mmCIF file of all heavy atoms in Angstrom:
data_model
loop_
_atom_site.group_PDB
_atom_site.id
_atom_site.type_symbol
_atom_site.label_atom_id
_atom_site.label_comp_id
_atom_site.label_asym_id
_atom_site.label_seq_id
_atom_site.Cartn_x
_atom_site.Cartn_y
_atom_site.Cartn_z
ATOM 1 N N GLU A 128 -27.854 -45.254 150.279
ATOM 2 C CA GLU A 128 -28.349 -46.424 149.606
ATOM 3 C C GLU A 128 -28.214 -47.761 150.316
ATOM 4 O O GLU A 128 -28.496 -48.819 149.962
ATOM 5 C CB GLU A 128 -27.635 -46.475 148.236
ATOM 6 C CG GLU A 128 -28.426 -46.626 147.125
ATOM 7 C CD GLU A 128 -29.570 -45.508 147.054
ATOM 8 O OE1 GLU A 128 -29.389 -44.359 147.099
ATOM 9 O OE2 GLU A 128 -30.739 -46.010 146.777
ATOM 10 N N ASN A 129 -27.927 -47.595 151.733
ATOM 11 C CA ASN A 129 -27.535 -48.880 152.548
ATOM 12 C C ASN A 129 -28.608 -49.380 153.357
ATOM 13 O O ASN A 129 -28.586 -50.383 154.149
ATOM 14 C CB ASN A 129 -26.493 -48.618 153.494
ATOM 15 C CG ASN A 129 -25.281 -48.037 152.689
ATOM 16 O OD1 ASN A 129 -25.151 -47.918 151.474
ATOM 17 N ND2 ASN A 129 -24.112 -47.776 153.432
ATOM 18 N N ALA A 130 -29.789 -48.661 153.531
ATOM 19 C CA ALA A 130 -30.865 -49.130 154.326
ATOM 20 C C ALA A 130 -32.234 -48.730 153.708
ATOM 21 O O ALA A 130 -32.287 -48.044 152.638
ATOM 22 C CB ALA A 130 -30.892 -48.316 155.610
ATOM 23 N N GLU A 131 -33.280 -49.568 154.101
ATOM 24 C CA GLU A 131 -34.480 -49.351 153.574
ATOM 25 C C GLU A 131 -35.455 -48.939 154.679
ATOM 26 O O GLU A 131 -35.344 -49.516 155.748
ATOM 27 C CB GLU A 131 -35.051 -50.543 152.707
ATOM 28 C CG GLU A 131 -34.415 -50.540 151.517
ATOM 29 C CD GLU A 131 -34.747 -51.788 150.654
ATOM 30 O OE1 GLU A 131 -35.890 -52.207 150.480
ATOM 31 O OE2 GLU A 131 -33.904 -52.434 149.902
ATOM 32 N N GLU A 132 -36.464 -48.240 154.402
ATOM 33 C CA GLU A 132 -37.386 -47.806 155.421
ATOM 34 C C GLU A 132 -38.434 -48.861 155.581
ATOM 35 O O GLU A 132 -39.181 -49.215 154.673
ATOM 36 C CB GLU A 132 -38.195 -46.477 155.131
ATOM 37 C CG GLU A 132 -38.797 -46.234 156.384
ATOM 38 C CD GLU A 132 -39.783 -45.169 156.340
ATOM 39 O OE1 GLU A 132 -39.705 -44.397 155.384
ATOM 40 O OE2 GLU A 132 -40.486 -45.133 157.323
ATOM 41 N N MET A 133 -38.545 -49.507 156.704
ATOM 42 C CA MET A 133 -39.673 -50.446 156.915
ATOM 43 C C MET A 133 -41.010 -49.795 157.115
ATOM 44 O O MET A 133 -42.012 -50.541 157.244
ATOM 45 C CB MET A 133 -39.300 -51.359 158.081
ATOM 46 C CG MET A 133 -38.345 -52.343 157.739
ATOM 47 S SD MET A 133 -37.282 -52.871 159.089
ATOM 48 C CE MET A 133 -38.511 -53.441 160.241
ATOM 49 N N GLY A 134 -41.030 -48.478 157.275
ATOM 50 C CA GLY A 134 -42.301 -47.762 157.237
ATOM 51 C C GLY A 134 -42.961 -47.598 158.562
ATOM 52 O O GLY A 134 -44.084 -47.138 158.618
ATOM 53 N N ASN A 135 -42.284 -48.169 159.506
ATOM 54 C CA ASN A 135 -42.819 -47.834 160.985
ATOM 55 C C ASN A 135 -41.810 -47.177 161.722
ATOM 56 O O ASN A 135 -41.627 -47.503 162.949
ATOM 57 C CB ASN A 135 -43.241 -49.225 161.572
ATOM 58 C CG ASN A 135 -42.051 -50.183 161.593
ATOM 59 O OD1 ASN A 135 -40.967 -49.997 160.902
ATOM 60 N ND2 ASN A 135 -42.120 -51.257 162.295
ATOM 61 N N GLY A 136 -41.078 -46.449 161.008
ATOM 62 C CA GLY A 136 -40.026 -45.517 161.767
ATOM 63 C C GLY A 136 -38.724 -46.441 161.965
ATOM 64 O O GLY A 136 -37.765 -45.962 162.648
ATOM 65 N N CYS A 137 -38.645 -47.687 161.529
ATOM 66 C CA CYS A 137 -37.433 -48.429 161.638
ATOM 67 C C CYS A 137 -36.773 -48.565 160.275
ATOM 68 O O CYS A 137 -37.508 -48.857 159.329
ATOM 69 C CB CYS A 137 -37.563 -49.885 162.001
ATOM 70 S SG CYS A 137 -38.437 -50.059 163.652
ATOM 71 N N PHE A 138 -35.469 -48.609 160.222
ATOM 72 C CA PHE A 138 -34.665 -48.809 158.924
ATOM 73 C C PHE A 138 -34.180 -50.274 159.058
ATOM 74 O O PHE A 138 -33.689 -50.699 160.099
ATOM 75 C CB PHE A 138 -33.521 -47.895 158.617
ATOM 76 C CG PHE A 138 -33.935 -46.461 158.523
ATOM 77 C CD1 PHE A 138 -33.833 -45.625 159.621
ATOM 78 C CD2 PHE A 138 -34.312 -45.939 157.298
ATOM 79 C CE1 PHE A 138 -34.266 -44.235 159.444
ATOM 80 C CE2 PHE A 138 -34.761 -44.602 157.224
ATOM 81 C CZ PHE A 138 -34.709 -43.768 158.367
ATOM 82 N N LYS A 139 -34.046 -50.888 157.918
ATOM 83 C CA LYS A 139 -33.469 -52.144 157.783
ATOM 84 C C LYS A 139 -32.099 -51.862 157.218
ATOM 85 O O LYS A 139 -32.069 -51.501 156.034
ATOM 86 C CB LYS A 139 -34.188 -52.937 156.833
ATOM 87 C CG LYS A 139 -33.601 -54.205 156.300
ATOM 88 C CD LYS A 139 -33.587 -55.436 157.302
ATOM 89 C CE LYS A 139 -33.112 -56.669 156.538
ATOM 90 N NZ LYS A 139 -33.686 -56.991 155.321
ATOM 91 N N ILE A 140 -30.980 -51.919 157.908
ATOM 92 C CA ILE A 140 -29.678 -51.752 157.363
ATOM 93 C C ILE A 140 -29.137 -52.900 156.698
ATOM 94 O O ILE A 140 -28.968 -53.991 157.290
ATOM 95 C CB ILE A 140 -28.726 -51.360 158.507
ATOM 96 C CG1 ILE A 140 -29.276 -50.194 159.211
ATOM 97 C CG2 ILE A 140 -27.256 -50.943 157.923
ATOM 98 C CD1 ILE A 140 -28.373 -49.680 160.510
ATOM 99 N N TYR A 141 -28.880 -52.854 155.263
ATOM 100 C CA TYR A 141 -28.458 -54.060 154.595
ATOM 101 C C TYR A 141 -27.066 -54.432 154.653
ATOM 102 O O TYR A 141 -26.307 -54.685 153.603
ATOM 103 C CB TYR A 141 -28.991 -53.841 153.108
ATOM 104 C CG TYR A 141 -30.411 -54.148 153.114
ATOM 105 C CD1 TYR A 141 -31.236 -52.901 153.090
ATOM 106 C CD2 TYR A 141 -30.925 -55.375 152.847
ATOM 107 C CE1 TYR A 141 -32.499 -53.115 152.959
ATOM 108 C CE2 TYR A 141 -32.305 -55.442 152.760
ATOM 109 C CZ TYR A 141 -33.064 -54.320 152.812
ATOM 110 O OH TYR A 141 -34.437 -54.442 152.593
ATOM 111 N N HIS A 142 -26.395 -54.328 155.796
ATOM 112 C CA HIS A 142 -24.899 -54.553 155.921
ATOM 113 C C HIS A 142 -24.537 -55.008 157.236
ATOM 114 O O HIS A 142 -25.374 -54.651 158.248
ATOM 115 C CB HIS A 142 -23.983 -53.496 155.314
ATOM 116 C CG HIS A 142 -24.004 -52.190 156.142
ATOM 117 N ND1 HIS A 142 -23.392 -52.099 157.264
ATOM 118 C CD2 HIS A 142 -24.558 -51.012 155.760
ATOM 119 C CE1 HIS A 142 -23.529 -50.879 157.665
ATOM 120 N NE2 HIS A 142 -24.268 -50.201 156.742
ATOM 121 N N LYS A 143 -23.464 -55.585 157.568
ATOM 122 C CA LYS A 143 -23.153 -55.921 159.030
ATOM 123 C C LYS A 143 -22.906 -54.592 159.665
ATOM 124 O O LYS A 143 -21.922 -53.971 159.384
ATOM 125 C CB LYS A 143 -21.985 -56.806 159.027
ATOM 126 C CG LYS A 143 -21.515 -57.376 160.377
ATOM 127 C CD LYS A 143 -20.067 -57.291 160.512
ATOM 128 C CE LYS A 143 -19.441 -57.414 161.967
ATOM 129 N NZ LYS A 143 -19.663 -56.184 162.827
ATOM 130 N N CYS A 144 -23.678 -54.345 160.703
ATOM 131 C CA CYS A 144 -23.321 -53.039 161.357
ATOM 132 C C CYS A 144 -23.350 -53.338 162.860
ATOM 133 O O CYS A 144 -24.256 -53.619 163.663
ATOM 134 C CB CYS A 144 -24.477 -52.023 161.112
ATOM 135 S SG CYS A 144 -24.426 -50.433 161.854
ATOM 136 N N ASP A 145 -21.980 -53.361 163.375
ATOM 137 C CA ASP A 145 -21.777 -53.687 164.844
ATOM 138 C C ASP A 145 -22.147 -52.485 165.679
ATOM 139 O O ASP A 145 -22.546 -51.354 165.203
ATOM 140 C CB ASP A 145 -20.337 -54.011 165.041
ATOM 141 C CG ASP A 145 -19.455 -53.092 164.344
ATOM 142 O OD1 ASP A 145 -19.198 -51.926 164.724
ATOM 143 O OD2 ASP A 145 -19.099 -53.606 163.330
ATOM 144 N N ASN A 146 -21.990 -52.490 167.015
ATOM 145 C CA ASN A 146 -22.136 -51.489 168.005
ATOM 146 C C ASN A 146 -21.523 -50.156 167.591
ATOM 147 O O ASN A 146 -22.152 -49.031 167.806
ATOM 148 C CB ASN A 146 -21.921 -51.852 169.342
ATOM 149 C CG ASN A 146 -23.096 -52.772 169.948
ATOM 150 O OD1 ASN A 146 -24.319 -52.652 169.505
ATOM 151 N ND2 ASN A 146 -22.903 -53.548 170.963
ATOM 152 N N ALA A 147 -20.419 -50.204 167.034
ATOM 153 C CA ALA A 147 -19.703 -48.924 166.765
ATOM 154 C C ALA A 147 -20.342 -48.316 165.557
ATOM 155 O O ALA A 147 -20.232 -47.003 165.389
ATOM 156 C CB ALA A 147 -18.198 -49.078 166.391
ATOM 157 N N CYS A 148 -20.748 -49.124 164.638
ATOM 158 C CA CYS A 148 -21.400 -48.782 163.466
ATOM 159 C C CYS A 148 -22.700 -48.073 163.884
ATOM 160 O O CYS A 148 -22.774 -46.852 163.679
ATOM 161 C CB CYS A 148 -21.763 -49.853 162.583
ATOM 162 S SG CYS A 148 -22.744 -49.582 161.210
ATOM 163 N N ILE A 149 -23.546 -48.698 164.729
ATOM 164 C CA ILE A 149 -24.748 -48.052 165.254
ATOM 165 C C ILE A 149 -24.444 -46.764 165.893
ATOM 166 O O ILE A 149 -25.007 -45.800 165.704
ATOM 167 C CB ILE A 149 -25.466 -49.074 166.200
ATOM 168 C CG1 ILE A 149 -25.943 -50.232 165.448
ATOM 169 C CG2 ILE A 149 -26.581 -48.277 166.699
ATOM 170 C CD1 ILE A 149 -26.952 -50.047 164.291
ATOM 171 N N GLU A 150 -23.339 -46.651 166.783
ATOM 172 C CA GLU A 150 -22.969 -45.431 167.300
ATOM 173 C C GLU A 150 -22.514 -44.335 166.283
ATOM 174 O O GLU A 150 -22.950 -43.169 166.547
ATOM 175 C CB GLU A 150 -21.886 -45.708 168.340
ATOM 176 C CG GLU A 150 -21.276 -44.525 169.156
ATOM 177 C CD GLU A 150 -22.141 -43.355 169.817
ATOM 178 O OE1 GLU A 150 -23.255 -43.661 170.378
ATOM 179 O OE2 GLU A 150 -21.739 -42.226 169.639
ATOM 180 N N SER A 151 -21.982 -44.671 165.145
ATOM 181 C CA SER A 151 -21.603 -43.606 164.212
ATOM 182 C C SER A 151 -22.835 -43.050 163.521
ATOM 183 O O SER A 151 -23.025 -41.816 163.186
ATOM 184 C CB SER A 151 -20.725 -44.152 163.110
ATOM 185 O OG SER A 151 -21.195 -45.109 162.254
ATOM 186 N N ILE A 152 -23.952 -43.878 163.290
ATOM 187 C CA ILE A 152 -25.196 -43.420 162.798
ATOM 188 C C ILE A 152 -25.830 -42.366 163.805
ATOM 189 O O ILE A 152 -26.117 -41.235 163.422
ATOM 190 C CB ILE A 152 -26.226 -44.476 162.436
ATOM 191 C CG1 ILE A 152 -25.618 -45.377 161.419
ATOM 192 C CG2 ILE A 152 -27.533 -43.913 161.965
ATOM 193 C CD1 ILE A 152 -26.439 -46.700 161.154
ATOM 194 N N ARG A 153 -25.875 -42.840 165.050
ATOM 195 C CA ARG A 153 -26.336 -41.979 166.137
ATOM 196 C C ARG A 153 -25.461 -40.685 166.274
ATOM 197 O O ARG A 153 -26.170 -39.712 166.218
ATOM 198 C CB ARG A 153 -26.302 -42.664 167.501
ATOM 199 C CG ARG A 153 -27.145 -43.971 167.415
ATOM 200 C CD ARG A 153 -27.695 -44.097 168.739
ATOM 201 N NE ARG A 153 -27.476 -45.415 169.248
ATOM 202 C CZ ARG A 153 -26.333 -45.579 170.118
ATOM 203 N NH1 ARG A 153 -25.711 -44.571 170.392
ATOM 204 N NH2 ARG A 153 -26.258 -46.794 170.722
#
């Protein structure tokens, strides 16, 4: 429930997500 699809293959993450956060999604 934390992101929405912008419809062009990008998600908008609705919370502060630093580089370690981005690495955990990855």
Side-chain angles (χ1 to χ4, degrees):
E128 234 49 56
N129 305 0
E131 284 178 36
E132 195 195 337
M133 278 154 61
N135 57 346
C137 303
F138 299 94
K139 165 82 170 307
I140 302 177
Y141 287 94
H142 68 73
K143 182 222 166 289
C144 180
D145 45 76
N146 281 332
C148 172
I149 296 300
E150 178 44 42
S151 66
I152 296 171
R153 302 213 231 96

